[PDB]
Symmetry: D2
Subunit: 462 residues, 4 copies
């Protein structure tokens, strides 16, 4: 145990800890959720502190002997070597100061240790003076967040694409599977199961497109903004160098925003991201609902498809296969809807040159991207690739249906069709085994009218 | 044509019009939705002004010569005689001031006409000095709203109670109708359709209680608050008297709030109402979702219940009955959900001594109550009463199901019960047929065990 | 007085009215809000039906005698002659069937009248067989909606651009006005009032881009889809010709969707639009909150700006001007936020081949575009143009602020800068007095360091 | 490692682990958030299992020698010793099946270890047959949740009551502190700081009552409902006995619901609780916004209150004390709003006999109560108790205001009051000074009229 001192008094900090008194006070102030910030945000903080250390050394502001160790420590943070030292709550007042200071304290203490000094000796390496040199909370925090959000969006994009590609493969696989289209949940006209899955795949491709476009506004960062965006005393060469480093180490084509005040006080880039995720989850939710309806049964349901079994069934009641993978998809969508409201409210609560409600916004943005990335993985792997069709049941739904008289209609006339429809309604007799009974269409010409392909695509009529 | 002057200038007003230059200025500021305030709010403003005049005259503050004509004019407003004269947009800046002034002008000008004077002659009877005497925007507008909301809620309770009883009648009409319970949309164990319709009756009874209890915090009113709630220059006798008239003429047991500063700045009684209406519509939307599933078909659906046709049918596809009445119920649910978010945002936006976002708040609270009332009566009259059951088809479902085995199990044992269920599901035979052919139970034994009542109620083995 | 017959019986229809029985049945089924659909939707229905008629006549499907009067009647609808005749509630079951049949009946009955026939004589011109020929509810309704929303969006874009520019004008006008930046509502470092208004202009510039970009997906229409998306019985020449007309008459670069099943069952174009509307109103609400803060006072507030007076005064209380215009703006934002949730819920609610929740979805989308257009136009005219800066009071705030010391710091050193700021804060003396008192700097040096421009832009101190 | 086989195959389980393959299966299906269920829910699952074991033993269903060990194991779960063994994601498909089984496995394996057997020997003590005897997922899970939410609500009530009591203590402390009331952020009329704090204290009192009344519907549990609510095969004696037990071990007055189907498929008790939490946070956010506004400054803000400092300030920026405790209060409210939408959407998604979306619902409800309890504690101990007033600053807002004229008005007539207000607006002369210079009132007369208590309480015209 070690002994750090504060405007509030002494606090005993374990010798093996890299955080200090400020981080502790933060945990005292905000024991709200018990969560820790996403390791990608931790990594991103390291990137910011590395870039800034490097830039400050380059412009002569930071001593090269201490900077060298500051860089080595930050690198270790980037590699995920110190995740457990980041202990502040994601829901914290102070507009992210605690998060920023946790990163400054840990990097300063690891630097000091790397140079054979004691921890807490902030005279040698100051969390504020050296590690946070030329930065404010108001630029270090949002810039690390932009970077972390962008990296997680690239992962969600490559996971959604994989999933989208597998929906397409199912579409192709069910390309000739004839079924009964439903509107208002009432039997309509024939459709191909492959057309439904292409529908799912096409909406998902438009989701990928929307989510990808939201990265553009995140590429503008406010590094060099200082407290408010005015850049008071900031060296314009520091700004140029720090941005360039941030882009190189993050892997993103970062730009210094054209108007730093704007970039410092506005939060539309995050609401833009959340909006696209919500839209995407709306579509996923609907698809999941369909999949669950289609899997219903086995005897009093639609029983159109089979989903892979993913929980042990009742060992005394077969046939009951709960669609747990789509269900979880639905509940995530619901998280994301809720997350989006929180983001919305946090964003409109901004005042003058800072929105102080970012910590709950970022926590929610990051949670959204992360849970989506994770359900897409498990749904794809555990449900989607394995989906099978009950093609006999769906073909019988079509043959015994009334709506197929729409395909026959123009070959026999509005007269004949309505008599056949009304009789198939009262007697429940097949429409096919009725055209041949009356002799209006031969066995051979029914076969080209009631063909799966002909019935579900534009072609000759009146 | 007539000509009144304002701080913005002289305005030409139609000869017939009873509103004045401040109403016209409010229609220029806020040409927002093109909508008009609810006639029930128009009515309550009438009750507010009449009560004020009566109190003021008695306190010896309003000239009895003018006051009696103000009263007469207000009575006409209460009768819904001048609804067309309330032209201000419900979505307006000014914290309701325009709404208040719309009532003041209209009641001033009509009073003036009743005593032979010119309209626009504000020297004789003033909208501000006489019709608005002793009251502020921040007491008249909210008080009228309480009275209007409460009146509206009373109608909803009455209508929701009627709907609840009709659900309960269907529960009894369906009391012996056996069917398949579904969990996760998968077949489970038997249930009666009457148990589901009693499930619906009960949640609705719970909503009625919740909605009813939100009345209490609305009975407290802030009349005499003046600008801020401190009641500076207000007369304690005017306060007691106006409150007693407001209670007598509105029909509600209205009370003067204990702390008028609290009553002027806080808006929780409004969000308390919306919440109970949100909860109610979650249940109704779900109920409606079930009904649309239950009415699905006719051939490729569930086909458990038949809903009265309200849409004309095609002569190409009979048996296609779209469940439009549950559909519109679903859509009203979604309105109310959205309205509740708007109420939330507007309520949390209060500042110091006054919430200025009250109009959009009140507009949404009034619309939620009104549209619920309307959908409830229409759903009750054009759907709920006419619902019929497909008993024969539901009995089939039960006969061919696997869940059935849960009733059979304790008369056979874990081992044989499971092998029967497994074989029934794989071969497609009914569990009854298998019980006969393997000799495990007699046709008579199975008729006693699969008793529709015994299968769906608590009770040990034999 | 006229008697049209429906499956629900004999019904009296005013001989003035151009709507028929299917329309008043929807008035009975859905007496929900009392509202009528947007004139822009009405117009687009007219474009849809005109286009249909032309395309049906060209392919040989429609009688040219009857078709010419349908076109003529459709033009009258397009030109706004018949708005009164559309009486159905925008919140309705039937998935837009009534909205579509409202348009069908009105166009038939006017085309009959133009031909010299009787209203109701549908044996001559039928609202189903002629006016609705080759179209389903499931394509004419959404196609009309796409056109309407697109038209409205183009209007909102023009208005929003006008507002944006007006913000840039104020940016330039205030480009020399110095004041205190606030982070956490706590005094920070100086900022130009112009940088704050430029920040507003830029986020609005991003809202315009985001909203404009939502148009692309609405350009894809599904005319030709029949019930479900397959185009069962459709003629490909009808589809290419109708699509060409719709695009010419609407003024929009419409395309037939590549996959009609997808374009028929998915609703992600509408949620995409609403999202960009919500995002915009988040920034606009924030801005407006700022304006109300900046305008607070005149004695116990901030008093940084004056907004045009838009409501009458109290001669008893001058100086009091409520910022009603930013107030209505915050309120329209709370509405759009609610509108967005209603839209989310309705879009998530889709099932298989059709989302039947489209009517409440569309009502809310159209409402959000309309109310945003209206407040933007009004806010620009009645507030934004005439905003004034209180230069004197803001320079006052700056001279006695502590943050001023961030500018002086590099010219005097940390130890003396901190000394002076602590003393200035505790004693209430200006930093400027204290720099002279101890002669750490002279009047002349202070006037050059404290240059408005240099304190608010990046650059090395020396 | 040990070896448990699954319908999906072999899986290695650590020697020290008490969960099994079903739990591992769950973690592979649902790697969504990485969170673990709340300790309170864990405890409650323990209470459920112990109550069920005791009931099953009494009724002769469960072996008393196995039962005794099961009960002892469950008691250790209740005691909080096996929290780390609960590894399943709160967000999961399967309607809580894996939360339920996680508890079944853990207790079985500890019961086995206590009775000297090998773990995974489910032939001795089965998680399904023994630990889960006479229960389904569809009753154990919700029953545990009712119990857990009740316990957490009772803690929230106590905490909020404490905060409330402290808000009242501060109203008394500021009972004579005079300030300027604000409407539209415009100076209005004098108010006491204590009157504001009483308004705060009073809204919270109403929140306490709302949240408390929410407990009633939760007292009804569905224990004994089995799959669907029908109680097929359930011993009625077991039901009433397990109910008496659950009430006794949980400390709540639990009652067996009067209709088990209703209780099994409806979730209105959850949405009701959440609505009451949301309303509470609407008020709390509003209060924090005022506090933050009043803390603003120190030189260019309002600065009416000082809040205890909770972060280390900048040594060169004294006076800058960010209101971090209110800021975190806002962020939690925003969180609760979104949580409430997720809940709304989860409840709405119920189908027939089971709402499978309960996991994301319960996760959200519990987080809402939890984070509320936690901010309330921290805000009270670190902010509220220590709030102090700048009474001089506030006093001079009142001396220098125009609105102080309202107190003078009746004593000098409106005509005279308007003249004095107008000059006060032009010159800047105190209204008090003006009254002296024009001799309208004696210095001693002003002392009665402009007395803090007199100015802020009902008192008449002379
Ligand atoms: Ca197959
Ligand atoms: Ca003091």
């Amino acid at each position: 145990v070690r002994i750090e001192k504060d405007f509030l008094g002494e606090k005993e900090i374990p010798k093996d800890a890299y955080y200090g008194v400020q981080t502790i006070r933060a945990t005292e102030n905000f024991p709200i959720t018990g969560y820790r910030i996403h390791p990608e945000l931790i990594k991103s903080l390291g990137i910011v502190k590395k870039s800034a250390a490097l830039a400050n050394m380059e412009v002569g502001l930071l001593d090269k002997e201490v900077g060298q160790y500051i860089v080595k420590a930050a690198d270790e943070v980037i590699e995920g070597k110190w995740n457990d030292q980041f202990i502040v709550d994601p829901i914290q007042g102070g507009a992210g100061t605690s998060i920023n200071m946790n990163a400054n304290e840990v990097i300063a203490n690891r630097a000091l240790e790397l140079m054979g000094e004691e921890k807490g000796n902030y005279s040698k390496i100051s969390p504020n003076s050296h590690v946070n040199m030329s930065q404010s909370t108001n630029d270090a925090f949002p810039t690390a967040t932009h970077i972390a959000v962008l990296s997680l969006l690239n992962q969600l994009i490559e996971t959604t694409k994989y999933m989208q590609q597998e929906f397409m493969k199912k579409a192709d696989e069910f390309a000739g599977v004839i079924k009964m289209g439903r509107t208002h949940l009432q039997d309509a006209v024939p459709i191909l199961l492959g057309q439904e899955f292409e529908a799912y795949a096409r909406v998902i491709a438009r989701d990928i497109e929307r989510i990808a476009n939201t990265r553009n506004n995140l590429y503008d960062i406010n590094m060099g903004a200082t407290a408010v965006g005015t850049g008071l005393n900031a060296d314009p060469e520091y700004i140029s160098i720090v941005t360039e480093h941030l882009a190189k180490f993050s892997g993103h084509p970062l730009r210094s925003a054209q108007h730093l005040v704007d970039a410092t006080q506005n939060t539309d880039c995050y609401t833009e991201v959340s909006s696209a995720l919500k839209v995407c989850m709306i579509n996923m939710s609907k698809i999941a609902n369909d999949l669950r309806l289609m899997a219903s049964g086995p005897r009093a349901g639609l029983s159109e498809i089979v989903l892979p079994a993913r929980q042990p069934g009742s060992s005394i009641m077969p046939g009951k296969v709960n669609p747990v993978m789509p269900e979880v998809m639905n509940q995530v969508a619901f998280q994301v809807f809720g997350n989006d409201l929180t983001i919305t409210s946090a964003s409109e609560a901004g005042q003058f040159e800072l929105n102080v409600m970012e910590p709950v916004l970022f926590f929610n943005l990051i949670q959204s991207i992360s849970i989506m990335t994770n359900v897409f993985k498990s749904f794809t792997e555990n449900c989607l690739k394995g989906i099978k069709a009950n093609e006999e049941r769906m073909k019988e739904y079509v043959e015994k249906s009334i709506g197929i008289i729409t395909a026959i209609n123009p070959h026999v006339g509005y007269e004949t069709a309505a008599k056949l429809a009304r009789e198939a309604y009262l007697t429940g007799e097949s429409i096919r085994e009725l055209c041949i009974k009356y002799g209006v269409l031969t066995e051979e010409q029914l076969n080209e009218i009631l063909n799966p392909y002909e019935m579900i695509h534009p072609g000759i009529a009146g």
